[PDB]
Amino acid sequence: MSEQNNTEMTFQIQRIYTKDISFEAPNAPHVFQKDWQPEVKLDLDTASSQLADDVYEVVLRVTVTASLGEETAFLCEVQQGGIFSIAGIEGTQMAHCLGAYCPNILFPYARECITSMVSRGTFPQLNLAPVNFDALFMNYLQQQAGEGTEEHQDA
């Protein structure tokens, strides 16, 4: 992050892994009487850590709460982390990279890790659908930035 050997962005996938897991099944044995796809409550979070210059390790936390009727079935949560060199990028292509390119490769891993903790708790098969993050955040940073004439004075 300077100018020298930057050009435009600095991107590379270095490592994929899990940083954190949680699974609490209060009605783990009680599932036997209830056979259907449970109520699912999705919550997410943004955690990161800086490792080096331009090297940031960004984490997608996916919280899943499951309930068969008006009773909790199980609780599950994964933090799909990954070591990346991601900096220098700007403008439109910023949200297009870390909102489309990066989430679509990490999603099957967070998803499967959730589905694994569910399947280890020996519950009904629960797997999440591939959502499009790209445009959702791309819209939020759109405000008349297409024509950057600025017009303040000179300097």
């Binding site: 996938i13 990161s48 850590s49 609780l75 499009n132 303040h152």
Partner: protein
């Protein structure tokens, strides 16, 4: 709660250590800037404010996406498919083309032309490491020996993770798949049903907590919000590819597989060469079978209705805005900044005449317009009756501006010409606020025993020794 159990929504905020993921403003929401926070009262908080003017729509409507790695041979198909999703159904199966015959339903011509020769793709580019932690000790402790890291070899290559090296990702072809008529300017129409999006996917505004019956919350009304390639996807566009194979691969692409490799000496030192003695598993008097009653297809099976429900509000809408902070950051220094490599000069010129929005001369507007705007949504149901046609320009998008914008004079207080790094921002501080460290829940508590009591502070009578699994 949250409509469709099989969801994901989005994410609270983008990655902060990269940079500030929001453009600055000056006239919040209103370009005309009416500006009137009553007088003594301010009215509603409306902290989001400018967010309602931030594009609007384009949830399911994709103007762009990408996902490649170090290798990726490809060529965009001529079909131009508008995909979408609607799983389960729970009524009529499907309708349209009764007969679906492939040219070769089973691969008689074969997709793979036999691995013994380069089919099309051969080369791979990735890097990773295996693991061990070789435990030891049986009696007393079932693992107490610090044994894993043998003396490291020269294997650590560093360059094993090559820094992308695309080049194609700029001055050839970007996504731009809805390059046609758009009833908005950027997104809506062009091809497919667009982000039709049956009402704002609020579920119960924010959370809801507990509603009457499941008829409102997903289980009854499960008409999915497009999803699964909602706009187009696989539209005629080149990914850039770059790393193409061809016949030139022959060095590796000869065949280090199927015949093992060139070292195939017909059973080298793996089959019987490793074994001297040992002759067990000649017979076993222990069978398996099912020692008790079972039912595979008892239940625990259902059709998961797969949807892409973003929900405009996740848990709580935080102030997602980062302006300048320093202010004199606009003035910048020797950096230039005005040259943003390569960018399109908006949509094609002469396309939209601004007839669809137009506006009105609201110099001094009264509460009449403010209240009726809540009622006017009924008028908006009718859509732009005037269908904006694809009216093309003489200059193709990127060449639509003749002169470039020179920096300094164009202050551009949101570009590479920035200072103070990110102005503190936020680190791993709130990590504890994410249900971290606190005893939030531990199932509920001990349910206690029945056949036994088992109520003793010492779990078993073995203080088992550790040192069985290191980092």
């Amino acid at each position: 709660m949250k409509q469709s159990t099989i969801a994901l929504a989005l994410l609270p905020l983008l990655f902060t250590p990269v940079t500030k993921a929001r453009t600055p403003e000056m006239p919040v929401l209103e370009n005309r800037a009416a500006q009137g926070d009553i007088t003594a009262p301010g009215g509603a908080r409306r902290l989001t404010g400018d967010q309602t003017a931030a594009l609007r729509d384009s949830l399911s409507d994709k103007p762009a996406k990408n996902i490649i790695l170090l290798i990726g041979d490809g060529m965009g198909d001529s079909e131009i498919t508008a995909a979408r999703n609607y799983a389960e159904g729970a009524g009529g199966f499907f309708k349209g083309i009764d007969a679906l015959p492939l040219t070769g339903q089973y691969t008689h011509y074969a997709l793979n032309k036999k691995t013994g020769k380069p089919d099309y793709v051969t080369d791979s580019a990735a890097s990773a490491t295996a693991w061990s932690t070789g435990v030891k000790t049986y009696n007393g402790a079932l693992g107490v020996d610090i044994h894993e890291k043998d003396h490291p070899t020269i294997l650590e290559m560093a360059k094993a993770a090559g820094l992308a090296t695309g080049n194609v990702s700029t001055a050839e072809l970007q996504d731009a798949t809805p390059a046609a008529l758009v009833a908005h300017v950027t997104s809506r129409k062009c091809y497919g049903p667009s982000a039709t999006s049956e009402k704002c996917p609020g579920n119960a505004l924010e959370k809801g907590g507990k509603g009457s019956i499941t008829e409102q919350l997903l289980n009854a009304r499960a008409d999915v919000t497009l999803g699964g390639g909602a706009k187009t996807f696989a539209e005629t566009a080149t990914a850039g590819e770059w790393q193409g194979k061809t016949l030139r691969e022959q060095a590796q692409a000869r065949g280090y597989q199927l015949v093992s490799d060139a070292a195939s000496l017909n059973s080298v030192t793996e089959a019987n060469q490793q074994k001297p003695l040992l002759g067990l598993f000649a017979d076993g008097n222990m069978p398996v079978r099912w020692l008790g009653p079972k039912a595979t297809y008892h239940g625990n099976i259902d059709k998961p209705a797969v949807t892409c429900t973003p929900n405009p509000q996740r848990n709580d809408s935080v102030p997602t805005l980062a302006q300048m902070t320093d202010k004199a950051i606009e003035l910048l220094s020797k950096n230039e900044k005005g040259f943003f490599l390569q960018v399109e000069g908006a949509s094609i010129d002469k396309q939209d005449h601004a007839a669809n929005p137009c506006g009105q001369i609201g110099e001094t507007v009264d509460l009449d317009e403010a209240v009726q705007r809540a009622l006017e949504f009924a008028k908006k149901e009718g859509n732009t009756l005037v269908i904006v046609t694809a009216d093309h320009a003489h200059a193709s998008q990127i060449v639509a501006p003749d002169t470039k914008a020179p920096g300094l004079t164009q202050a551009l207080n949101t570009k590479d010409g920035a200072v103070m790094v990110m102005s503190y921002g936020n680190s791993e501080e709130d990590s504890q606020e994410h249900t971290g460290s606190q005893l939030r829940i531990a199932a509920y508590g001990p349910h206690a025993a029945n056949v036994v009591g088992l109520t003793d502070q010492t779990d078993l009578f073995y203080t088992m020794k550790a040192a069985l699994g290191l980092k």
